[PDB]
Amino acid sequence: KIEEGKLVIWINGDKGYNGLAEVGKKFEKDTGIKVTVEHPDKLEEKFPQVAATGDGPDIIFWAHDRFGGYAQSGLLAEITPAAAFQDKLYPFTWDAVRYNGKLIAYPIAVEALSLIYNKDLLPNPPKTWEEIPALDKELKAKGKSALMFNLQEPYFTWPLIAADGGYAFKYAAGKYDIKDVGVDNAGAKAGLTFLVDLIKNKHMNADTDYSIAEAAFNKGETAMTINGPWAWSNIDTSAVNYGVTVLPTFKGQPSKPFVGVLSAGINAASPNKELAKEFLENYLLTDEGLEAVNKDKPLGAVALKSYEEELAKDPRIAATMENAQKGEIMPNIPQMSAFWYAVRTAVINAASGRQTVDAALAAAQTNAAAMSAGLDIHFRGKTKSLGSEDSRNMKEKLEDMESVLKDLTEEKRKDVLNSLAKCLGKEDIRQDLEQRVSEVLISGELHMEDPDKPLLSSLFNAAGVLVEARAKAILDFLDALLELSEEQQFVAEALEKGTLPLLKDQVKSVMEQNWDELASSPPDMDYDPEARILCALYVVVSILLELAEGPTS
Ligand SMILES: OC[C@H]1O[C@H](O[C@H]2[C@H](O)[C@@H](O)[C@@H](O)O[C@@H]2CO)[C@H](O)[C@@H](O)[C@@H]1O
């Protein structure tokens, strides 16, 4: 379901979609090709699901951080711009859309969060974050609020977290370390802890989201908000006289917002690649086209040199660039999905009081690291010289495995878990145990008990007959556990601290977005992407969670 000779474009709702459609219409008029511009919800999550089937839009507009993940799954076409054309755009923007040396998207614009303030309610904005609690006390007296911004998305929360020294992935030498995730460090704790206090002292509300905060600032009910260029259009149509400035400092350090480069990527499934190329290069990425989009809802500082020269005279763009400078540009790697999901949970849970700050962030680190290790794929291989024609869907396999382990004595369950837990990280222990359980399934062992056979005992029912289903369930778990390398250590961390349910939830969200649908034909050895591993991870986690039933370790 793609469509030849027609362009379908997906872009986020807060951006200038109407303005982009205006560009679309100018394309239709000249070239005679129909351009539809849609703005699905959960757009970034929907695309990889749809694109994996072969369906989906021809062009996708998102910030560059998602694109490496898309590229690794093979859902983006490599772009081939002319060297002459590349010279029209700033070179750093190209770097944002370069994954493993291939260009994978057209950079459109640079966006970064800036502090937006109402000049009437407050003539002089606060240079520090630590001033804000005081001013809220003051503005509460006039019936107003000091600060409201979106707390649901970590994009907005992050600059504060990153200020004193939070980071996503350590970037030393010039290359990212996936195993080193900086959400559990002191600076991150400090930053988040502060944010939580503002909610704890009724200066902000945990329930606040994009709609509420935007509404409140534009109705004049609050003195400040934190937001990107796109937001300015709706404030302009509003009555408010506003300014755009640098974000407040925390612990005498600047807020470090993550910086996105809004980028357009061409679906690998699309037959309209040359159409898309022409549309982006010659129609969108021109002074005329960008102006159309920008006029609807501002892009920020565009990638196009010619048009940026015009825009840079604006004071609001200068404010945006000062913030972008103080912050860091987002990595485009696949692991960013993992990072973001982890932090999203942590922040919401610490704000809602569901977990302590130190706990939420300590989980986020484990889960981010586990996951990020899962998406690696590079330098993954085997060593060797029965095998198992497993014939079964993976969603089915788990359904069966969980069903067998459900029907077990609480004492046997505990015995299984302890024996499986010892395998995490130790390949010899996992190898030994697979041979043992295979010996029982072939031969005969019988009721009894031991210091490592408490498991083998649990394969037998309450009459001392063997349940074959139990043994294979264990073998299937161990076969899955083999696929896992570095993240085994983190699965063990999760089991220990009791954060498997969070990990599972997270694995489930990045498995594109289904499970039922991310399982069809049984392993043909012709597939094998991030999929094979994430499945194993999901299995290993789900089983350990099932066995750590309810609330136990
Ligand atoms: O909240 C995590 C989210 O942040 C970024 O998405 C931004 C992006 O710069 C814009 O598209 C704008 O609409 O705000 C979004 C946040 O609401 C990342 O691009 C994205 O990966 C991440 O999920």
mmCIF file of C-alpha atoms in Angstrom, residues 361-494:
data_model
loop_
_atom_site.group_PDB
_atom_site.id
_atom_site.type_symbol
_atom_site.label_atom_id
_atom_site.label_comp_id
_atom_site.label_asym_id
_atom_site.label_seq_id
_atom_site.Cartn_x
_atom_site.Cartn_y
_atom_site.Cartn_z
ATOM 1 C CA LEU A 361 17.334 7.542 37.761
ATOM 2 C CA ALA A 362 19.169 4.395 38.888
ATOM 3 C CA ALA A 363 16.540 2.307 36.993
ATOM 4 C CA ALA A 364 16.716 4.569 33.962
ATOM 5 C CA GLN A 365 20.447 4.010 33.780
ATOM 6 C CA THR A 366 20.083 0.170 33.988
ATOM 7 C CA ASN A 367 17.259 0.101 31.502
ATOM 8 C CA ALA A 368 18.897 2.559 29.136
ATOM 9 C CA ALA A 369 22.173 0.608 29.275
ATOM 10 C CA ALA A 370 20.506 -2.796 28.871
ATOM 11 C CA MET A 371 18.565 -1.609 25.923
ATOM 12 C CA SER A 372 21.312 0.363 24.343
ATOM 13 C CA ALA A 373 23.531 -2.753 24.503
ATOM 14 C CA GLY A 374 20.723 -4.635 22.843
ATOM 15 C CA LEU A 375 20.678 -2.352 19.836
ATOM 16 C CA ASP A 376 24.448 -2.687 19.256
ATOM 17 C CA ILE A 377 24.723 -5.386 16.580
ATOM 18 C CA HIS A 378 28.252 -4.632 15.566
ATOM 19 C CA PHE A 379 30.891 -7.328 16.293
ATOM 20 C CA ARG A 380 28.199 -9.886 17.134
ATOM 21 C CA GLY A 381 29.044 -13.436 16.125
ATOM 22 C CA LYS A 382 29.454 -17.065 17.243
ATOM 23 C CA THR A 383 31.950 -20.007 17.611
ATOM 24 C CA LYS A 384 31.462 -23.720 16.768
ATOM 25 C CA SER A 385 31.702 -26.830 14.578
ATOM 26 C CA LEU A 386 20.594 -31.248 18.582
ATOM 27 C CA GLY A 387 20.173 -27.795 17.004
ATOM 28 C CA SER A 388 16.358 -27.460 16.996
ATOM 29 C CA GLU A 389 13.934 -26.873 14.100
ATOM 30 C CA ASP A 390 11.770 -24.779 16.363
ATOM 31 C CA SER A 391 8.936 -24.238 13.823
ATOM 32 C CA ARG A 392 7.149 -21.713 16.067
ATOM 33 C CA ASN A 393 6.377 -17.979 16.143
ATOM 34 C CA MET A 394 8.186 -16.187 18.986
ATOM 35 C CA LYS A 395 4.983 -14.612 20.452
ATOM 36 C CA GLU A 396 3.614 -18.139 20.499
ATOM 37 C CA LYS A 397 6.771 -19.566 22.093
ATOM 38 C CA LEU A 398 6.513 -17.120 24.983
ATOM 39 C CA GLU A 399 2.773 -17.715 25.411
ATOM 40 C CA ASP A 400 3.614 -21.456 25.825
ATOM 41 C CA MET A 401 6.625 -20.904 28.106
ATOM 42 C CA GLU A 402 4.715 -18.555 30.420
ATOM 43 C CA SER A 403 1.776 -21.009 30.543
ATOM 44 C CA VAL A 404 4.015 -23.870 31.726
ATOM 45 C CA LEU A 405 5.744 -21.768 34.411
ATOM 46 C CA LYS A 406 2.393 -20.338 35.650
ATOM 47 C CA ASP A 407 1.279 -23.836 36.733
ATOM 48 C CA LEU A 408 4.079 -24.359 39.328
ATOM 49 C CA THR A 409 4.570 -24.566 43.073
ATOM 50 C CA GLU A 410 5.792 -21.333 44.657
ATOM 51 C CA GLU A 411 8.742 -23.309 46.075
ATOM 52 C CA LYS A 412 9.663 -24.707 42.603
ATOM 53 C CA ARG A 413 9.266 -21.275 40.947
ATOM 54 C CA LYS A 414 11.783 -19.849 43.485
ATOM 55 C CA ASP A 415 14.140 -22.765 42.773
ATOM 56 C CA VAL A 416 13.992 -22.208 39.001
ATOM 57 C CA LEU A 417 14.627 -18.492 39.274
ATOM 58 C CA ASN A 418 17.676 -18.930 41.507
ATOM 59 C CA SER A 419 19.211 -21.406 39.062
ATOM 60 C CA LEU A 420 18.408 -19.256 35.990
ATOM 61 C CA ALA A 421 19.685 -16.112 37.733
ATOM 62 C CA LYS A 422 23.123 -17.719 38.246
ATOM 63 C CA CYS A 423 23.423 -18.003 34.421
ATOM 64 C CA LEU A 424 23.217 -14.229 33.856
ATOM 65 C CA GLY A 425 26.703 -13.127 32.755
ATOM 66 C CA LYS A 426 28.335 -16.566 33.157
ATOM 67 C CA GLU A 427 28.349 -18.451 29.816
ATOM 68 C CA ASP A 428 29.888 -21.588 31.379
ATOM 69 C CA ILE A 429 27.051 -21.866 33.925
ATOM 70 C CA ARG A 430 24.494 -21.397 31.131
ATOM 71 C CA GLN A 431 26.296 -24.017 29.011
ATOM 72 C CA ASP A 432 26.486 -26.525 31.889
ATOM 73 C CA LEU A 433 22.822 -26.123 32.706
ATOM 74 C CA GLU A 434 21.690 -26.518 29.082
ATOM 75 C CA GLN A 435 23.563 -29.864 28.883
ATOM 76 C CA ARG A 436 22.052 -31.019 32.228
ATOM 77 C CA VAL A 437 18.446 -30.170 31.198
ATOM 78 C CA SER A 438 19.071 -31.724 27.757
ATOM 79 C CA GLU A 439 20.340 -34.907 29.486
ATOM 80 C CA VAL A 440 17.051 -35.104 31.455
ATOM 81 C CA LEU A 441 14.883 -34.519 28.393
ATOM 82 C CA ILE A 442 16.737 -37.333 26.496
ATOM 83 C CA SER A 443 17.288 -39.893 29.373
ATOM 84 C CA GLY A 444 15.808 -40.004 33.002
ATOM 85 C CA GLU A 445 16.717 -38.315 36.377
ATOM 86 C CA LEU A 446 13.781 -38.672 38.958
ATOM 87 C CA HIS A 447 12.416 -36.959 42.005
ATOM 88 C CA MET A 448 14.867 -35.690 44.495
ATOM 89 C CA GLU A 449 16.699 -32.463 45.243
ATOM 90 C CA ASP A 450 20.103 -30.813 45.275
ATOM 91 C CA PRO A 451 22.394 -27.615 45.556
ATOM 92 C CA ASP A 452 21.932 -26.960 41.791
ATOM 93 C CA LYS A 453 19.310 -29.593 40.971
ATOM 94 C CA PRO A 454 16.572 -27.677 42.814
ATOM 95 C CA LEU A 455 15.785 -26.707 39.206
ATOM 96 C CA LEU A 456 16.020 -30.225 37.766
ATOM 97 C CA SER A 457 13.684 -31.208 40.569
ATOM 98 C CA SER A 458 11.179 -28.584 39.383
ATOM 99 C CA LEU A 459 10.945 -30.300 35.962
ATOM 100 C CA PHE A 460 9.074 -33.145 37.721
ATOM 101 C CA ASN A 461 5.419 -32.792 38.814
ATOM 102 C CA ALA A 462 3.996 -33.497 42.297
ATOM 103 C CA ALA A 463 3.786 -37.308 41.457
ATOM 104 C CA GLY A 464 7.459 -37.565 40.303
ATOM 105 C CA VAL A 465 6.603 -37.840 36.569
ATOM 106 C CA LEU A 466 8.585 -35.592 34.179
ATOM 107 C CA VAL A 467 6.867 -32.707 32.424
ATOM 108 C CA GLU A 468 8.674 -32.485 29.052
ATOM 109 C CA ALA A 469 7.087 -29.013 28.502
ATOM 110 C CA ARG A 470 9.008 -27.625 31.495
ATOM 111 C CA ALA A 471 12.402 -28.769 30.259
ATOM 112 C CA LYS A 472 11.976 -27.308 26.756
ATOM 113 C CA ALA A 473 10.606 -24.077 28.302
ATOM 114 C CA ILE A 474 13.905 -23.896 30.223
ATOM 115 C CA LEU A 475 15.870 -24.733 27.070
ATOM 116 C CA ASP A 476 13.982 -22.047 25.109
ATOM 117 C CA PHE A 477 14.805 -19.502 27.818
ATOM 118 C CA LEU A 478 18.470 -20.507 27.719
ATOM 119 C CA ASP A 479 18.521 -20.427 23.901
ATOM 120 C CA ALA A 480 17.206 -16.872 24.115
ATOM 121 C CA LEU A 481 19.678 -15.987 26.877
ATOM 122 C CA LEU A 482 22.495 -17.027 24.503
ATOM 123 C CA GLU A 483 21.547 -14.227 22.050
ATOM 124 C CA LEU A 484 22.155 -11.670 24.816
ATOM 125 C CA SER A 485 25.729 -10.510 25.497
ATOM 126 C CA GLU A 486 26.456 -7.347 27.479
ATOM 127 C CA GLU A 487 22.834 -6.616 28.581
ATOM 128 C CA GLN A 488 22.721 -9.878 30.638
ATOM 129 C CA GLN A 489 24.619 -7.971 33.340
ATOM 130 C CA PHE A 490 21.913 -5.252 33.293
ATOM 131 C CA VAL A 491 19.032 -7.772 33.261
ATOM 132 C CA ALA A 492 20.608 -9.108 36.443
ATOM 133 C CA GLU A 493 20.699 -5.567 37.914
ATOM 134 C CA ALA A 494 16.999 -5.157 37.089
#
